[PDB]
């Protein structure tokens, strides 16, 4: 019912190591449950809120081990670097690691340890020694970037068996009751605290447009012209359905001599740290990406997001656009789509085998098409999917305004009802 305010020493720790002056509410609710109440958590946090602080902060505060489990190996490398820049010792642990590195974890060097779901199953005795010798503040089972996953996730029911005293934070991307029930049974969570941040990003304007037949003609509205050169109005990410289309979009932007970078799924640590530096320093105006996570696209002042093609589904779409406007200033997210787009092609779906995943692909395909075809508020459609209920239109202060979405804006441009309270 009531959450106590963080004490002085807790706020000071958050300032020294994470560079924040105060907690956001759901962050504190999750942190306080884990740190002070030792309670299992299922935390529904939309992207951009600060998921990663909820499991990084407690172990740093008490100087103990925090165990983070995630299937995305490159993302965990990116976080370990970010933590090292913040003076926080962290490592990514696997069988490929030296026996020497395992020594430092036993001795307690690393506040935050990253492992894959597979590694965690085969080294349970190692964890209990870490519990006995050093002490574990929490176990973070992310699975909020889960795509096409398995046995790996059902082998984690042993954590509460081997480590009954260690709280578990389960981060998730939807408020779905079905997902929450599955997570609770899989992890054997005990009366878990449930939180939800909500999913709105009021500073993102949502537009959908049809393609015109040529890449340059589609991108022309998004370019401004200095008397010498063409440029985007601001830092821009362009999401493509494939690396072939990324190279096509890249080729057209060279014709205008635009600072561009590509961001794909097999890039090395150096390549990802190079894109990050160039993107944040504005040395490249635009990133054309085939993935929706990692260092390279982690920038605070991305002004424009363009989907050059229909997105695969709402979950990917929400994550992709959530990289924009992280500074809280105005941003725009445009989809450029055609009915023949790859992520809207049903006929390709026949060739792949698995049934009821083709049906899931079918349902996501049809849901995505309904969104792109909608004449109603696009913000309402997205929030209703992630809240798993019917979000009432114009309850939030942004919906129904010229800043909300192209359908609201055009309706207000044609004698719409600017709603007074
Ligand atoms: N309490 C806070 N006060 C101010 N800024 C914060 C706070 N917590 C987090 N942030 C900042 O908000 C931004 C979003 O946080 P973060 O980078 O952890 O995203 P995320 O939700 O974990 O994303 P993803 O889904 O990609 O993992 C970052 O710039 C982070 O430093
Ligand atoms: Mg994160
Ligand atoms: Zn309490
Ligand atoms: Zn709207």
Swiss-Prot record:
Cystine bridges: none
Subunit text: Monomer, and homooligomer. May exist as homodimer, homotrimer, homotetramer and/or homohexamer. Homotetramer, or homohexamer, when bound to DNA. Interacts via its N-terminal domain with WRNIP1. Interacts with EXO1, PCNA and SUPV3L1. Interacts with PML (isoform PML-4). Interacts (via KBM motif) with XRCC5 and XRCC6; promoting recruitment to DNA damage sites. Interacts with RECQL5; this interaction stimulates WRN helicase activity on DNA fork duplexes.
Keyword hit for Lyase: no
Changes after translation: Phosphorylated by PRKDC.
Family: Belongs to the helicase family. RecQ subfamily.
GO biological process, one term: base-excision repair
Domain Helicase C-terminal stretches: 218-368
Protein purpose: Multifunctional enzyme that has magnesium and ATP-dependent 3'-5' DNA-helicase activity on partially duplex substrates. Also has 3'->5' exonuclease activity towards double-stranded (ds)DNA with a 5'-overhang. Has no nuclease activity towards single-stranded (ss)DNA or blunt-ended dsDNA. Helicase activity is most efficient with (d)ATP, but (d)CTP will substitute with reduced efficiency; strand displacement is enhanced by single-strand binding-protein (heterotrimeric replication protein A complex, RPA1, RPA2, RPA3).
Keywords attached to this entry: Acetylation, ATP-binding, Chromosome, Disease variant, DNA damage, DNA repair, DNA-binding, Exonuclease, Helicase, Hydrolase, Isomerase, Isopeptide bond, Magnesium, Metal-binding, Multifunctional enzyme, Nuclease, Nucleotide-binding, Nucleus, Phosphoprotein, Repeat, Ubl conjugation, Zinc
Motif placement: DEAH box: 142-145
Domain named Helicase ATP-binding: residues: 32-193
Consequence when changing residue 51 to M: Loss of helicase activity, loss of DNA-dependent ATPase activity. Does not restore chromosome stability in depletion experiments
Gene: WRN
Main location: nucleus
A GO term for molecular function: G-quadruplex DNA binding
Name of the protein in its database record: Bifunctional 3'-5' exonuclease/ATP-dependent helicase WRN
Gene Ontology CC, one term: cytoplasm
Record has Heme as a keyword: no
Binding-site positions, ATP: 20, 22, 24, 27, 48
Domain remark in the UniProt entry: The KBM 2 (Ku-binding motif 2) and XLM (XLF-like motif) mediate cooperative interaction with XRCC5/Ku80 and XRCC6/Ku70 and recruitment to DNA damage sites. The isolated helicase core (residues 517-1093) interacts weakly with the HDRC domain in vitro.
Cell compartments where the protein resides: Nucleus, Nucleolus; Nucleus; Nucleus, Nucleoplasm; Chromosome
Annotated disease: Werner syndrome: A rare autosomal recessive progeroid syndrome characterized by the premature onset of multiple age-related disorders, including atherosclerosis, cancer, non-insulin-dependent diabetes mellitus, ocular cataracts and osteoporosis. The major cause of death, at a median age of 47, is myocardial infarction.
Residues engaged in binding Zn(2+): 377, 404-405, 408
């Amino acid at each position: 019912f009531l959450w106590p305010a963080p004490n002085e020493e807790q706020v000071t720790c958050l300032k020294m190591y994470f560079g924040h002056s105060s907690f956001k509410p759901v962050q504190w609710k999750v942190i306080h449950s884990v740190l002070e109440e030792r309670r299992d958590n299922v935390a529904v946090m939309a992207t951009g809120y600060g998921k990663s602080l909820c499991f990084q902060y407690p172990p740093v505060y008490v100087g103990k081990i925090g165990l983070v489990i995630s299937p995305l190996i490159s993302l965990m490398e990116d976080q370990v670097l970010q933590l090292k820049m913040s003076n926080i010792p962290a490592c990514f642990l696997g069988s490929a690691q030296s026996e020497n590195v395992l020594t430092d974890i036993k001795l307690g060097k690393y506040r935050i340890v990253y492992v894959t779901p597979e590694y965690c199953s085969g080294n349970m005795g190692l964890l209990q020694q870490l519990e006995a010798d050093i002490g574990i503040t929490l176990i973070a089972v992310d699975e909020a970037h889960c795509i096409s996953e398995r046995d790996s996730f059902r082998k984690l029911g042993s954590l509460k068996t081997a480590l009954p005293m260690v709280p578990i934070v389960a981060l998730t991307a939807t408020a779905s009751s079905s997902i929450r029930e599955d997570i609770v049974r899989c992890l054997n969570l005990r009366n878990p605290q449930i939180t939800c941040t909500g999913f709105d990003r009021p500073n993102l304007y949502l537009e959908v447009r049809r393609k015109t037949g040529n890449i340059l003609q589609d991108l022309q509205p998004f370019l401004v012209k200095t008397s010498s050169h063409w440029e985007f109005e601001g830092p821009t990410i362009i999401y493509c359905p494939s690396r072939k289309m990324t190279q096509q979009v890249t080729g057209e932007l060279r014709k205008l001599n635009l600072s561009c970078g590509t961001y794909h799924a097999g890039m090395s640590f150096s390549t990802r740290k190079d894109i990050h530096h160039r993107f944040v320093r504005d040395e490249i105006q635009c990133v054309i990406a085939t993935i929706a996570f990692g260092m390279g696209i982690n920038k605070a002042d991305i002004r424009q997001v363009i989907h050059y093609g229909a997105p695969k589904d709402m979950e990917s779409y929400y994550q992709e656009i959530g990289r924009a406007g992280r500074d809280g200033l105005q941003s725009s997210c445009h989809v450029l789509w055609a009915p023949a787009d790859i992520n809207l092609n049903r006929h390709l779906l026949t060739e792949i085998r698995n049934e009821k995943f083709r049906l899931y692909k079918l349902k996501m395909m049809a849901k995505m098409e309904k969104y792109l075809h909608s004449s109603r508020c696009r913000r309402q459609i997205i929030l209703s999917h992630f809240e798993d209920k019917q979000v009432q239109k114009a309850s939030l202060g942004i919906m129904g305004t010229e800043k909300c979405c192209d359908n609201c804006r055009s309706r207000l441009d044609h004698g719409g009802r600017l709603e007074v309270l």
